[PDB]
Amino acid sequence: EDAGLVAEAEAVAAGWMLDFLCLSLCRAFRDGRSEDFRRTRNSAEAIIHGLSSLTACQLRTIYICQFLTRIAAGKTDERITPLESALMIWGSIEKEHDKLHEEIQNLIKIQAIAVCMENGNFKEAEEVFERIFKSKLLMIISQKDTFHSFFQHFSYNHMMEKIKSYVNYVLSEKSSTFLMKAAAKVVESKR
Amino acid sequence: EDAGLVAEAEAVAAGWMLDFLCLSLCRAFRDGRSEDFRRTRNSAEAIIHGLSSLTACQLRTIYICQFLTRIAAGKTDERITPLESALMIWGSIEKEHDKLHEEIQNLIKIQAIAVCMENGNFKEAEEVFERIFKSKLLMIISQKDTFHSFFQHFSYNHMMEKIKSYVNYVLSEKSSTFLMKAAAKVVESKR
Numbered sequence: 001e002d003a004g005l006v007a008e009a010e011a012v013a014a015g016w017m018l019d020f021l022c023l024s025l026c027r028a029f030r031d032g033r034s035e036d037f038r039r040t041r042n043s044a045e046a047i048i049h050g051l052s053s054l055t056a057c058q059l060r061t062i063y064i065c066q067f068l069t070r071i072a073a074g075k076t077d078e079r080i081t082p083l084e085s086a087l088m089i090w091g092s093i094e095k096e097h098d099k100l101h102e103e104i105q106n107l108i109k110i111q112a113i114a115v116c117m118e119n120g121n122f123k124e125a126e127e128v129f130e131r132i133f134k135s136k137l138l139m140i141i142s143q144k145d146t147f148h149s150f151f152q153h154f155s156y157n158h159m160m161e162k163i164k165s166y167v168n169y170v171l172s173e174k175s176s177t178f179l180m181k182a183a184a185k186v187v188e189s190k191r
Numbered sequence: 192e193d194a195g196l197v198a199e200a201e202a203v204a205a206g207w208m209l210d211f212l213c214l215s216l217c218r219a220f221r222d223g224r225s226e227d228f229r230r231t232r233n234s235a236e237a238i239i240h241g242l243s244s245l246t247a248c249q250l251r252t253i254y255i256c257q258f259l260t261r262i263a264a265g266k267t268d269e270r271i272t273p274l275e276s277a278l279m280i281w282g283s284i285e286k287e288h289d290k291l292h293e294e295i296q297n298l299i300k301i302q303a304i305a306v307c308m309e310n311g312n313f314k315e316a317e318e319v320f321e322r323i324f325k326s327k328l329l330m331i332i333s334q335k336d337t338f339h340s341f342f343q344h345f346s347y348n349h350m351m352e353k354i355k356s357y358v359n360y361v362l363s364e365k366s367s368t369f370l371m372k373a374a375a376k377v378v379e380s381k382r
């Protein structure tokens with residue numbers, strides 16, 4: 001038995017498990033299956049400790065998973081909120097800055113403030129605003145005007161809809177990865 | 192897309208990941224790769240939350256993994272020690288009670304006391320003795336006779352050697368499971 005070849009096979013399998021768990025995380029996010037999302041997130045987080053070197057494709061995969069983890073915790077050792085952390089990941093993923101990227105970016109920026117107002121924490125809403133960003137938005141926060149028409153166009157539902165359309169593209173791109181394809185064949189054979 | 196067929200494929204893949212991670216955990220235990228063992232253990236623990244129903248084979252797999260986890264923590268919400276917890280798993284696994292089973296059982300029973308004496312905790316050694324079990328063993332603990340010839344036949348090294356021989360049988364039995372076999376093929380193709 002060669003120790004190097006065994007370690008290489010473990011790294012190949014970790015890569016397969018990462019894609020499979022990304023696909024499961026994407027579907028759970030799309031479906032709103034919170035408990036399944038939490039379980040898949042924990043498995044993907046543990047599995048990637050088996051990798052010390054990642055390709056460009058694998059880095060994009062883990063950053064998509066970290067991004068969805070923050071978006072899912074949006075209303076729930078960093079001194080920033082989950083939506084602010086999602087915005088940092090979003091702005092640094094190796095991906096095209098098309099119209100959809102910018103739409104998601106601006107929806108998260110406004111919702112990072114609006115989720116604080118929804119929870120009744122207006123001081124945090126101002127702190128979030130100061131870290132991200134103008135005089136019209138600060139007057140809205142100061143007036144506790146949570147249902148201002150600006151927030152109805154840049155809504156939480158609109159942020160989730162746009163992120164879900166992005167998730168469907170990731171989902172289709174990874175639907176043919178090794179582990180899910182082999183698992184679907186086994187299920188189809190029964191049946 | 193059928194939600195039931197997607198969930199079935201996820202359960203098939205969780206099963207494949209469980210066998211792969213058992214095989215990796217067995218090799219790391221055999222090799223004494225502590226950090227790799229800790230990482231694999233965490234991944235296997237997270238992955239099995241994706242399973243709510245297990246076959247007899249899968250139950251044996253998870254119990255072997257829980258047993259090795261306690262043996263590896265042997266010298267490190269239950270009011271018992273890790274070796275005592277390993278003994279509980281060992282005595283209830285659906286497996287043959289051959290001579291090797293009994294040898295491992297008795298080595299763990301004595302080492303559960305001896306590891307407390309090694310750490311200088313003789314009160315715990317007596318508490319462990321009371322929970323497991325005689326007058327000769329209690330005199331040894333009372334006298335802090337850690338290097339009594341009884342402990343040299345029923346040694347920690349002998350316990351580890353016997354458990355490692357058992358691990359080699361599990362390792363050979365699972366060496367042909369789906370995920371490792373497909374991963375070894377990929378590595379062999381390069382080389």
Ligand SMILES: COCC(=O)NCc1ccc(C)cc1
Nearest residue numbers: 041044045048062065066069
């Ligand atoms: C880095 O901060 C922790 C975190 O985001 N955990 C969720 C997580 C899910 C999935 C993957 C691949 C990686 C991480």
Ligand SMILES: COCC(=O)NCc1ccc(C)cc1
Nearest residue numbers: 232235236239253256257260
């Ligand atoms: C049940 O007590 C926790 C524990 O033993 N964790 C390690 C663990 C490793 C591997 C598997 C499959 C399952 C559990």
